[PDB]
Structure 1
Amino acid sequence: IGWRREGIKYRRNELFLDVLESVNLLMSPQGQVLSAHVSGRVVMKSYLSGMPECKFGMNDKIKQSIAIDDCTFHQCVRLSERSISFIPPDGEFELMRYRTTKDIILPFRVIPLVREVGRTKLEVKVVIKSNFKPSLLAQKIEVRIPTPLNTSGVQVICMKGKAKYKASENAIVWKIKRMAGMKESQISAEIELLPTNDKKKWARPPISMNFEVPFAPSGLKVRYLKVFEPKLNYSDHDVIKWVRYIGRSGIYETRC
């Protein structure tokens, strides 16, 4: 086996899995999801004794059960429910890579509201809502609200987080360190406008977010990682096993 040498021993047989997903979304002003998908990989870190034969199972019949549009594996994987089998390399490696479009969890919903006030002001309210177990925290949230090019200034109020108006980037940026499942937050801004060429209207680009969440928005869950080394005297239960999910936004736009 050219990916794993032959005499590895560890007193503490222990492995680590990372399910890394990036969630993507294009949503219309009327709440319809125009397009959405998730890309993910599973990375494993293993410090197991021998040349063990592991079995990776997750929620894929296709409660909990998810549908994978496609995916590729690491050579060590023996192709042929029917689950994934391999003798992994030692250390850290990319077990599989996958894609997904159905029954995806959109961790965040964004609700924009905008009010034209004569020719001087825009009034904008934006609400974000977290869609997930309240026991879970999202971290590193940013909402990004574009302003027209004739903005002379911006005032905003927001009871959670901080938001700076950023002229170079032509956007209001709201940042929240942590926020829990099933909650709501909002921001209000008033945008003061220079005069402009009446004729060319403003093309409102989407409001966009960045966030990181501790679960796989594809819904994928790890169920088991069975280890078997037949020559040596450690069994599956001897193995300490950890798993952790890091879901993050890719592109996540909402049109107003």
Structure 2
Amino acid sequence: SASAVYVLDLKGKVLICRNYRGDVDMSEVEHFMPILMEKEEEGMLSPILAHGGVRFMWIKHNNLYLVATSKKNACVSLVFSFLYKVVQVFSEYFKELEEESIRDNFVIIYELLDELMDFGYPQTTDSKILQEYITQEAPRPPATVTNAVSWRSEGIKYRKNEVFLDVIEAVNLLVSANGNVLRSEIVGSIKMRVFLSGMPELRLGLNDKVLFDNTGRGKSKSVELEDVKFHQCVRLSRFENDRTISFIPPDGEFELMSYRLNTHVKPLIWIESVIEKHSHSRIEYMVKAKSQFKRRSTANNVEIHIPVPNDADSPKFKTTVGSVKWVPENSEIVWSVKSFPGGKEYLMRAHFGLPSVEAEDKEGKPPISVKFEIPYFTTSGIQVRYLKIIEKSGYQALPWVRYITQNGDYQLRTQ
């Protein structure tokens, strides 16, 4: 239950404002930015500020503070999911979202905030359907905005019939400095790119553990999906009965399912870092990167960020394979390796100076955080098995898939 969706910017001037209820005054937004500066300059920052009896829910995009006030017992999960869906609608019209798009597209952004929300209750936010009666270039609203299938305008025609999948893994890791592994979870995201003709009914079938157990095949390779979060398009009752994933797809790119499973197997890339930090003199980094994964797959463009001290100087970098740039904007040495085969072990030795007069404040210890990307290689072992195109028209479509492992927050705590 939002009251007034604003768009602020980094100074406190309103790029665009649009109140829905009138239960919050319009000059309450001028009280936002001093309250945020006050709550941030004492460390009590929160997404829910408080100016008397008006609460400021807000998210912070690139330049934008999409503040949306309320007054009552506001449904905060609804307000924040609506703010990130406003961010996604703007970024699907305007390919970046900065101040240079809000002051140029007030023809269409007031129409969007007219359309998305009424009285505080979000009602039509699927952008691929919203591109059909709110344009920057009006007819009747489509029957998609009415009907139960509210994400797919009927009558889409392509010459070819291609369904592109992307079973993109994302290994999380958080290795404590003693050497043991704390949280090693994997967040996959099957991210489709659909190009079909009509109103199809796909039936995606994974190698889900509960499906292989209800069938009777509980001794082969089966991924154990701990929690699965689907898109809207997946009918969830049929998924809850017998683990069948049936969905009428949208047209374009979206995130079909976002699974998450834990893993008690070794990390993929392991970073044994030491630090010879003499006080007032220098520091050394005999960091080695052993690739625990299979010998066949090649970790494209790993970037082992390694946090140096803030004021280090005059570096030296004896590596084995791969360039080292010292990035002092971030105070880290981004040790890049382009082709990093599985089973190898590449060693690096940085060497800095250090200022002789000591610092004034302490700095903290950020983690070594790699940026790896191993294609054709699923860590959890999920295998897509089929994708049944069902269409009343009747045709042979061409499904496709590829496999990527990435990093999630692949961090490793330091000395």
**Normalised-by-shorter TM-score class:** 0.7 to 0.9
**Paired AA for residue 200 in structure 2:** P
Aligned to 2:50: none
Q: Which amino acid aligns with 1:228?
A: I
Q: Name the CA distance, whole Å, in 2 between partners of 1:213 and 1:31.
A: 24
What is the aligned partner in structure 2 of residue 178 from structure 1?
339
Q: Which residue of 2 aligns with 1:131?
A: 292
- Residue in 2 that maps onto 1:101: 262
Pairing 1:44–2:192 present: yes
One-letter amino acid matched to 1:92: E
Q: 2:251 maps to what in 1?
A: 90
**How do 1:214-253 and structure 2 match up within 5 A?**
214=375, 215-229=377-391, 231-234=392-395, 238-253=396-411
Following superposition, the deviation at residue 133 of structure 1 comes to: 2.9
**Bigger CA radius of gyration:** 2
Q: Closer, same or farther in 2 for the Cα pair 1:105/1:45, shift >3 Å?
A: farther
Residue 253 (structure 1) shift? 1.6
d(CA) in 2 for partners of 1:163 and 1:106?
A: 23
Normalization by structure 2: what TM-score?
0.54
Q: 2:162 aligns with which of 8, 14, 25?
A: 14
Deviations for 1:90-125, whole angstroms, at most 9, x for unmatched residues? Answer: 333332223232346732111112335586333321
The Cα shift of 1:254 comes to 1.4
Which of 1 and 2 has higher RCO (CA within 8 Å, sep 6+)?
Answer: 1
- Tell me whether 1:120 sits opposite 2:278 in the alignment: no
Contact 2:186 2:263 in 1 (8 A): no
> What's the secondary structure of 2:330's corresponding residue?
coil
Gapped runs of 5+ residues in structure 1? none
3-state DSSP of counterpart to 2:389:
strand
Whichever structure has more strand as a proportion of its residues is 1
Cα distance in 1 for residues equivalent to 2:243 and 2:257: 15
| CA root-mean-square deviation | 2.8
TM-score w.r.t. length of structure 1: 0.83
Partner of 1:69: 226
Matches within 5 A, 1:190-209: 190-197=351-358, 204-209=365-370
Instruction: Give distance in 2, aligned partners of 1:176 and 1:117.
Output: 28
Unmatched runs of 5 consecutive residues or more in structure 2: 1-148, 211-219
**Residues 119 and 84 (structure 1), Cα distance of their counterparts in 2 relative to 1, 3 Å cut:** same
Higher helix share goes to which structure? 2
Report Cα offsets for 1:4-59 as digits up to 9, x if no partner.
34434444322110123332211023331112323332222222333322111122
Indicate yes or no: 2:235 matched with 1:78: yes
Measured after TM superposition, the shift of residue 228 of structure 1 is: 2.3
Residue 227 of structure 2 aligns to which amino acid in structure 1?
D
Change (3 A) 1:2 1:131: same
Rounded Cα–Cα distance in structure 2 between residues aligned with 1:4 and 1:54: 13
SS at match of 2:410: strand
Alpha-carbon distance in 2 for matches of 1:168, 1:74: 38
Whole-Å separation in 2 of the counterparts to 1:58 and 1:28: 34
Q: Distance in 2 between matches of 1:77 and 1:24?
A: 26
Give the C-alpha shift of residue 204 in structure 1: 4.2
Do residues 58 (structure 1) and 206 (structure 2) align? yes
Q: Give the share of equivalent positions with the same residue, in percent.
A: 43
CA, structure 1 residues 239+121, in 2 after alignment: closer, same or farther (shift >3 Å)?
A: same
Q: Given the superposition, is the C-alpha separation of residues 196 and 60 from structure 1 closer, same or farther in structure 2, using an over 3 Å criterion?
A: farther
Instruction: Note if 1:32 corresponds to 2:189.
Output: no
